[PDB]
């Protein structure tokens, strides 16, 4: 007896340079010109059906909010329930489809995004979300494309992890999708498509109701359409934008919820968790919860640090994409002795940072923030820096929302390590600095940890190897992705993989399968 | 550059025969006598302090409940808090110890349980939990010794990653920040070695609230762990009232996990409690629950009768049906029923219930406690009085000396009857006879009536029916057996939080 099986090897997607005069840069110019003055009417999609509700919404271009880039609509309770019923009816066949065949769909999609549709996806994230070319490219390759390929590899390989059969028994493991539907959730004004939120569970034989982010609707739908064109069957991913609280209430009330794959705030994730608990007796299976949230990320500097590494790494981490990354640095700890040199260089380099239209100027460092709500929040923080007796704005500080949601990169010194601006997430281009006494570095390391609530990333700058070892221990639970002499947002498995994707991590892909052990005796 | 990798080759612990004249039987007979008429005094242990409270409790022998086998005590709130504080103070150094060092303790402990402590652990589980010799042996080798060894291997290999060279990159597998509660209910049947042990191995500290009904054996494993080099305050040995313990740990801002085994409703209760309390915790607690189900054997007309009969009786009645994986419902086609029924009753009459320590011929002994006995007794009266149910064999019980229940076989004319659906965790097997040409409809019925799908089995000589049944029942059981019994014949990842460290040179 014998069975045909498959194996899969994958390389990371290269990140293109887009050099002045290069060809990808040519196609991107064309894609961007394609979006200028254009809007897409994006329906909810249940099965192969396009559905409209009267609850119409608009995505605008962050750097030109006069430009409505998309019109969509919020699903209502009725539509969501139909989406659920149709997904459930499709699930069993999808679950039973061989993993090699499911993988092939995601590999096709990856290849489409890598080549024919790369310009399209980049342009839609640039125009629709305010990404610069380099930011959009990095995200397209390391996050979206790499996750499709490396998930597929992981799934195919997992399939090959099989028990040795010890006769008179034949043993095998079947990697079942979860029984029910998975809800994939990102916040209404999130800065990411979060394609992996629906993509990972789908790949593993699940069905998904995907509530994408309002502020990423254009690009999110572009990914959905590509998955479908690549051969994703109907009712595997339901495309269902919706009010955040309504979507949450509906899926956690469903007896058929088997999972929530969430990115967003800790309070929101806590709310969903509580709702699942409240309804625990009503579910046909125990829902699995996956939450990526946090955090107020830090760079700690020791007096032995390379000043230019600090300054370069910190400006980039704090201000790339307007500091709108889950991993962005928003707090800097510097020793009194090194502060004058660092402060000086920070300010000089701050002056080089170009803020503007990323489509018009590829020299742009970062662009407007995501939406009006975020512009408002950040402005309040700027006002707080300019008024609190503990706070001094050292650079930037101004904002203007007349054409786009534009905020200058802002550097703020705090005399108080416990100041709200040191502890609360702004998700904006606002860097706080605490200058600590050189004889108190050890104590300050402990301070970084103790003032860390939901710490995602962090970095230590130090040439002193002893200090690095010390910090690595003290800060062991102050950051999931921890960097030594590099920036907290990382640098250039999936290239954008990290703590959350590793075994034991909340987004480890194995969480979307329930292994069944089958044992046959002869 | 280059590095050594580290791995661990591990073989399964052999299961001994205990034949008359064998050294292991000689050793066990000796350990059993030592327990006769003796009561161990088992304290709470916090760090290295043995601590008594006034809330004294007793473990008794299920088959001879006049025999107190252990005296112990329940931790109060003050002691639990003290145990939490002391464990938290010890956690960072334990977490930082290399995994090889931690794994070594568990390997030593497994080797001790394998050799010089084997007779002890077997005797303590027999006398204390009512297990027969082979049941005690299978459990020690599998749920205790193999778990220690294989978990150690998985942990050690977890740090066996690709070499990264100067821009270096590695993953550090951190224990969870806080303490983990290891909980099993006061009258559950588990020793709990792997409940407390798995999270400890992964660099966590643990408050372990063992089952009262298994206290003697549980403390024996605790002591062996410490003797093997487990440092103080890594596992706190804290028997306690179930509700008090659950309330205390879930009210603690430092809870980072609950590793539980017991009933689904109790697990759901703890799950709800953690969620209600979510706002206080410094990290999101992780919960794990290993629970029982209403497990099935499905028979197709082509099945081998003797296999069906032997497999079903063994799965239903070994350890009195007190296994999470035990068969409690049997589905049989009309054409095979007369043959299957007749053989079931003939074999049933040969099942000896008695003292497992005094009589090694015993098939199974008393059930674990009075609450279980009462629950079982109510199902027996339900079987007797319900219009839809006929007791085919057994049905009696007697708690005058031990919690003795005859193995019971019941036929249900209704596939939706409570006895077909509700977990009894006892020696009660329910049978539904289905029309031969409705086997398709019946397969779906097995699945639709499955609330918790732990294990199951299909008996069929027809390969085409096997393939069919596996698809239909895909979600009716996590352990699925073909022509074998439902009790048989990467989990540790929940207790670690990976950190990725990247350095630019
Ligand atoms: Mg990610």
UniProtKB/Swiss-Prot annotation, chain B:
Site entry: Transition state stabilizer: 187
Ligand binding (substrate): 489
Active site: 290, 324
Localization annotation: Mitochondrion matrix
Expressed in which tissues: Highest expression is found in liver followed by skeletal muscle, kidney, heart, brain, placenta, lung and pancreas.
Binding site for NAD(+): 184, 209, 262-266, 423
Taxonomy, superkingdom: Eukaryota
SUPFAM superfamilies: ALDH-like
Signal peptide (residue range): none
Consequence recorded when altering residue 328 to L: In HYRPRO2; allele ALDH4A1*3; loss of enzyme activity
Molecular function as annotated in GO: 1-pyrroline-5-carboxylate dehydrogenase activity; aldehyde dehydrogenase (NAD+) activity; electron transfer activity; identical protein binding
Residue numbers bearing the N6-succinyllysine modification: 9, 71, 77, 92, 108, 153, 323, 371, 485
Pfam families membership: Aldedh (PF00171)
UniProt EC number: 1.2.1.88
GO cellular component: cytosol; mitochondrial matrix; mitochondrion
GO annotation terms (biological process): 4-hydroxyproline catabolic process; proline catabolic process; proline catabolic process to glutamate; proline metabolic process
Quaternary state and interactors: Homodimer.
Pathological association: Hyperprolinemia 2: An inborn error of proline metabolism resulting in elevated plasma levels of proline and delta-1-pyrroline-5-carboxylate (P5C). The condition is considered to be benign, but affected individuals can exhibit neurological manifestations that vary in severity. Clinical signs include seizures, intellectual deficit and mild developmental delay.
Name of this protein: Delta-1-pyrroline-5-carboxylate dehydrogenase, mitochondrial
Species of origin: Homo sapiens (Human)
